[PDB]
């Protein structure tokens, strides 16, 4: 099953507008292999990632994850971003973190301009338990059992400068790939769309 | 304790005149703040000895023109010449070629160790002045960003304190 997992498949979508403030949170991401939100109206279908279907048939999972944030700007856009890794669980008040407090956590800077789009950001296993359970089979929250080993925040590290004859937004795609992945104790569970 | 820390975010505009100082800050004092991981090592240890790594990234649109200056100044800009700043280890900016420079300077200070609670004078003072005016026509955007990524190099720690 390695053939479907490490191939980068689209999981989310967020643009980079120019009408935002310096350090404003754009999108928060629960980092897990269970992540998908896109769909389609015609035909009636909800788009799935190739990583999530492999991992939705297990009780536990363990392994690293690689996000691929591909931008499609013009050659004249600029500004930067900050890809901070905030660990823990899926349920804190994560949207109160100051931008300089995110500098203590591990991160990666990136320039928007240039001739290389995809930055292959890899997720380490920051965890308290060695085996991380599929909690989405249950319907009641419980401390001790988690599904996300961290949360990704794409900050507005700088604003968007642009010419007049283009638009005021740069779309960033979210692929999903994984490495050193391990799963056991099979089940069956049809996952639900995470609307964050 | 050695990782790039954004310390200031300003925006270089078109309405600035020639030789206008865009940024005026202390590199050492802005790294002394609660929102960084270098607070965790410097809070128990009073004395400090460090080199200064500087990387500054700007983002102009290619339908503008102009240039900047980024010099590293020990102490203050008391009576130094604006036109003779290239004797300092500097890095220039251009709307034609590049947008990333780096400057590595050593610890220039009257003493050897540093006291955080009562400094005599600031050790380094990063200066950014308008080297050429930013001109636009009609439709070209009238703003371009500016960011300063700074970090320590070769840190020593001596003489632990009980107070914060």
């Amino acid at each position, epitope marked *: 099953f390695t053939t479907w997992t490490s191939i980068p498949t689209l999981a989310a979508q967020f643009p980079f507008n*120019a009408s935002d403030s310096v*350090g*404003q*949170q754009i999108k928060v991401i629960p980092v897990d292999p269970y992540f998908f939100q896109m769909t389609n109206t015609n035909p009636d279908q909800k788009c799935i990632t190739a990583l999530a279907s492999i991992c939705q048939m297990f009780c536990f999972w363990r392994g690293d994850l690689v996000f691929d944030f591909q931008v499609f700007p013009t050659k004249y856009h600029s500004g930067r971003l900050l890809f901070c890794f905030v660990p823990g669980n899926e349920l804190i008040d994560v949207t109160g973190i100051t931008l300089k407090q995110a500098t203590t956590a591990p991160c990666a800077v990136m320039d928007i301009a240039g001739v290389q789009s995809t930055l292959r950001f890899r997720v380490p296993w920051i965890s308290d338990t060695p085996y991380r359970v599929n909690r989405y089979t249950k319907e009641a929250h419980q401390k001790g059992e988690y599904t996300a080993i961290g949360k990704l925040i794409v900050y507005c590290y700088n604003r968007l400068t642009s010419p007049s004859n283009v638009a005021h937004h740069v779309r960033v795609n979210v692929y999903l790939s994984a490495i050193n992945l391990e799963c056991f104790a099979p089940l069956y569970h049809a996952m639900d769309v995470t609307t964050q | 304790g050695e990782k790039f820390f954004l310390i200031h975010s300003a925006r270089w505009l078109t309405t600035h005149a020639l030789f206008h100082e865009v940024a005026k800050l202390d590199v050492v004092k802005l790294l002394y703040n609660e929102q960084f991981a270098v607070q965790g090592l410097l809070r128990y240890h009073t004395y400090a000895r460090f080199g200064i790594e500087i990387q500054v990234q700007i983002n102009p649109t290619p339908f503008q023109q102009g240039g900047l200056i980024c010099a590293m100044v020990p102490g203050d800009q008391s009576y130094g010449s604006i036109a003779s700043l290239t004797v300092y280890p500097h890095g220039l900016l251009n709307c034609n070629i590049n947008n990333v420079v780096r400057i590595k300077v050593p610890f220039i200070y009257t003493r050897g160790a540093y006291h955080f609670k009562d400094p005599q004078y600031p050790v380094w003072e990063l200066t950014i002045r308008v080297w050429s005016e930013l001109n636009i026509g009609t439709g070209t955007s009238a703003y371009t960003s500016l960011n300063v990524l700074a970090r320590f190099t070769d840190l020593e720690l001596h003489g632990l304190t009980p107070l914060s």
Partner: antibody
Amino acid sequence: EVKLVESGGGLVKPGGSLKLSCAASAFTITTYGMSWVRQTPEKRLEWVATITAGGSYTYYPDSVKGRFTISRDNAKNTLYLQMSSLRSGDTAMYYCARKVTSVAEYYFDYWGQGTTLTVSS
Amino acid sequence: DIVLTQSPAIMSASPGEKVTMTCSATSGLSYIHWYQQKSGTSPKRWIYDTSKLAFGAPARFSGSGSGTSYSLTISSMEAEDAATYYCQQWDVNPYTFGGGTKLEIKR
């Protein structure tokens, strides 16, 4: 376009109660923490309530501490301000407010139209 | 808990001249925001920390200052600036705003 449209307000006798609300559109409010900003008719605004993305961290000032109660629902994408023990000092205009995050402090981006609560009988 | 006042209360200024108000803190403040209450509507994205305008705000304005006293210096007076501003700190528990400067048009 963002429309943080309030709803509620009216005429409550002093000693009564009221539950405010603010509808939301063009974005998910599940990230940004929201706020109620009260406009006195003497042009003196006051920051009285703010709860974060989850329903855990509440930041109450000295004045409304023990009087009012803020609540949210991330699925319905609306707001709630359960008020009680009303008096003439809170006879003022209300505004739902979105709080966003800057580099060292926080900041308000988008505000609403406003609901009138006159606490007098 | 500390009080933010504003030294201009009611100001009337001619089109095309220099206008400057002041939000004078009674303490050392880092970054003092500003707002714009237009007559009939609510304040919006107007000014953040000290010199960072919004995206829809006109680029003819200026803001500066260090330490206590900050100034929002207007370089070009126009007709759409007949509104009331505020000023805010973000460092205590009880966030109190400014007094309000009603800047109108001197005809």
